[PDB]
């Protein structure tokens, strides 16, 4: 009980410190800038090769190649500009909830309900992509996986823990042990020195890879967080919950900055991503269509309607030139 | 064809070849009937896996009368059921094992099992997915109801302690948790360590789901 009292006192201290700095809302500051978000994005390409619900996708660094994963059991590596399939990687477990594409372009990764983050070698002397490693240390389903290098990967798993790996050894050089519910999301800040995870206890945490600690915690939502994503500074990030309200927390000031809700939308937010500026914020809903939120002034500044089922994944190219959304109708679309 | 380099054209040829192999593998994958096995009767579920003659999901491919079932055992997945349950939005049928003899072992196991059935029978995902229902562990339920009364779990039950009345009662307040009585069908079956009656039953109740899915797909129903 005494430890509970100490925890309550520390929580009170944290809430007081949070209120102390909360001088003004971001909306007030941005009230004096031009609302210029009125945009229309036309489906520039449709990538149709998957035969089941696409659960994840990732972009290559060049903003030309993208990997996608689906319950089809396949992991296709696409060419955006030509809608070509460079590779199709047959997995040993159809239940895949994630995929990653290395910043070097050499490897991909693919996790899921089988608890193994497998890793595939694309550049090899034979002509085939072969499973270079299978990382096996989680107890629950893997939800997100992000490459840091060609040698270390970070993954988040339904066992409430995230763990940076070391692919050659096969071991976890670190496990982050803070959350209380499932962890469903992951993003890497551009310097890759830190990363944030959004768990189903309706919280997000600011990890730190080299240390393994947990520095910050953001608790604004009223339900689980199904997708998280940084602002390109690596200074703020946006979490999409299942209470239909994605939010823009910032690493500094420890606190929410804005909520992106409109009474018209009530479905949960499946994906969240920014655009190279950051002035634009996409989103992805269970209600079959994206949005486009004027990140600096919450306003549904356009709609990427056009998907026949839930959008499960969303990624803006590295150069910013296009946004690709996947969806349980098994089509990825490019919206320049 | 025009405006395409030699390599820029051989790349397209490779893409078309890849697409051929995706179609082939998708057909071969769709051939398999995908059952989902889940039930709080861990001993019951392992025994059921045992009659079905062949760390996360545990697929159990078996084959009967030319169907290619593919039973997924998820109970090793100890997490929030809400978050991965939609992966199985398209399973042909859910198998559900509950031990009959555990009606008075602890909240008694029967009540936990029926809460689980009620939850997994009314997801927004399984609104058209027929639920097969095995009531295994029958033989020892016989003796254990010979000794103990069924009121240990159900205070409101008022009837003889004969095996038949108790069994029909158990089937009654499982099959009555089905809110959507017009779409889903809750196939039920009492089983023990007995013969291939069990796989016969699953085949019988997966054929009747293939029929209904075909009628729905043909717009005819």
């Amino acid at each position: 009980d005494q430890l509970r009292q100490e925890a309550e006192q520390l929580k009170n201290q944290i809430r007081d410190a949070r209120k102390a700095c909360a001088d003004a809302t971001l909306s007030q500051i941005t009230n004096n800038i031009d609302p210029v978000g009125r945009i229309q994005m036309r489906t520039r390409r449709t990538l149709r090769g998957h035969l089941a619900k696409i659960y994840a996708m990732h972009w290559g660094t060049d903003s030309r190649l993208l990997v996608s994963a689906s319950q089809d059991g396949k992991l296709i590596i696409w060419d955006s500009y030509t809608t070509n399939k460079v590779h199709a990687i047959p997995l040993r477990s159809s239940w895949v909830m994630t995929c990653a594409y290395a910043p070097s372009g050499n490897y991909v990764a693919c996790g899921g309900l089988d608890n193994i983050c497998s890793i595939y070698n694309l550049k090899t002397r034979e002509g085939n992509v072969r499973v270079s490693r299978e990382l096996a240390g989680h107890t629950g389903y893997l939800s997100c996986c992000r490459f840091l290098d060609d040698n270390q990967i970070v993954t988040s798993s339904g066992d409430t823990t995230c763990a940076l790996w070391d692919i050659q050894t096969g071991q976890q050089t670190t496990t982050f042990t803070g959350h209380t519910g499932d962890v469903m999301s992951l993003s890497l800040a551009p310097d890759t020195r830190l990363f944030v995870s959004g768990a189903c206890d309706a919280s997000a945490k600011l990890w730190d890879v080299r240390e393994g600690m947990c520095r910050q915690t953001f608790t604004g939502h009223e339900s689980d967080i199904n997708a998280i994503c940084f602002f390109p500074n690596g200074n703020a990030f946006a979490t999409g919950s299942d209470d239909a309200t994605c939010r823009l927390f910032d690493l500094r000031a420890d606190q929410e900055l804005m909520t992106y809700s409109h009474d018209n939308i009530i479905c949960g937010i499946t994906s969240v991503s920014f655009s190279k500026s950051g002035r634009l914020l996409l989103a992805g809903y269970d209600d079959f269509n994206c949005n486009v939120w004027d990140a600096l002034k919450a306003d549904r500044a356009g709609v990427l309607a056009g998907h026949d089922n839930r959008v499960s994944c969303l990624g803006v190219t590295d150069d910013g030139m296009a946004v690709a959304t996947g969806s349980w109708d098994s089509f990825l679309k490019i919206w320049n | 064809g025009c405006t395409l380099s030699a390599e820029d054209k051989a790349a397209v040829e490779r893409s078309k070849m890849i697409d051929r192999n995706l179609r082939e593998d998708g057909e071969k994958a769709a051939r398999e009937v995908k059952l989902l096995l889940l039930g709080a009767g861990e001993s019951g579920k392992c025994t059921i896996v045992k009659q079905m003659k062949i760390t996360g999901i545990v697929e159990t491919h078996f084959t009967f009368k030319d169907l290619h079932f593919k039973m997924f055992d998820v109970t090793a997945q100890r997490s929030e059921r809400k978050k991965w349950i939609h992966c199985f939005e398209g399973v042909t049928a859910i198998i559900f094992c509950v031990a009959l003899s555990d009606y008075d072992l602890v909240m008694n196991r029967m009540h936990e099992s029926m809460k689980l059935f009620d939850s997994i029978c009314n997801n927004k995902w399984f609104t058209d997915t027929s639920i097969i229902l095995f009531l295994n562990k029958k033989d020892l339920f016989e003796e254990k109801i010979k000794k103990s009364p069924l009121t240990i779990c159900y205070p409101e039950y008022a009837g003889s302690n004969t095996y038949e009345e108790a069994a029909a009662y158990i089937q009654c307040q499982f099959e009555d948790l089905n809110k959507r009585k017009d779409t889903k069908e809750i196939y039920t079956h009492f089983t023990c360590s007995t013969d291939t009656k069990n796989v016969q039953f699953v085949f019988d109740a997966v054929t009747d789901v293939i029929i209904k899915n075909n009628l729905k797909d043909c717009g005819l129903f």
Partner: single-chain antibody
Amino acid sequence: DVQLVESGGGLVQPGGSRKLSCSASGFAFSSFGMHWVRQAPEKGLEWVAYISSGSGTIYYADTVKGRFTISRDDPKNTLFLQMTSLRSEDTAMYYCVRSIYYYGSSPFDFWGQGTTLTVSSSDIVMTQATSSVPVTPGESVSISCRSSKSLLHSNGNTYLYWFLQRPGQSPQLLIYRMSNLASGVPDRFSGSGSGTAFTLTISRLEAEDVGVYYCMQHLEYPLTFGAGTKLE
């Protein structure tokens, strides 16, 4: 261990026929598009025939259409060239060269040992003049190859390849699409240029780089080679 071994060499009377066979090993032979590149007794490389992955596409040199036929045996990993009516211009050493085409691939990357053959007695022209230059170890040399037609497609990629032929070995691919230093090749090499003007740049040249260097155009079939520039 990605060896390719060609068999079917010997002496053939003119007007005869012969089966050439290349046995693959150590690679996913069914996923590759294999070539045949001959080489006259003391002359440069010369493209012969190409068969795609899945055998959908088959091209031929203008000098062998009808006379030659290329086929692959995918389940057993062996590539077959059927030669009919062997004139005296076919006496040459025939090579087995694999090539896989996707976005960012490395075609012509592995060259087989190559079988020898003897017979008893609109196309883009790539000019690689200055066939021989003396070489001082520790120096830097640049080889020049020129194209009749602009090798810069609209896609933005200039289809130029650079092959080194070691003395009495199989050529190793050096540079693909005019800039990308192919894998397994030391950094000191470099390629550059624009359409119809090319240059292979070597830095700190040392031994075991002597040989004859060739260029390829790969916009349009038939692929054509330069006459080959020699180092000594």
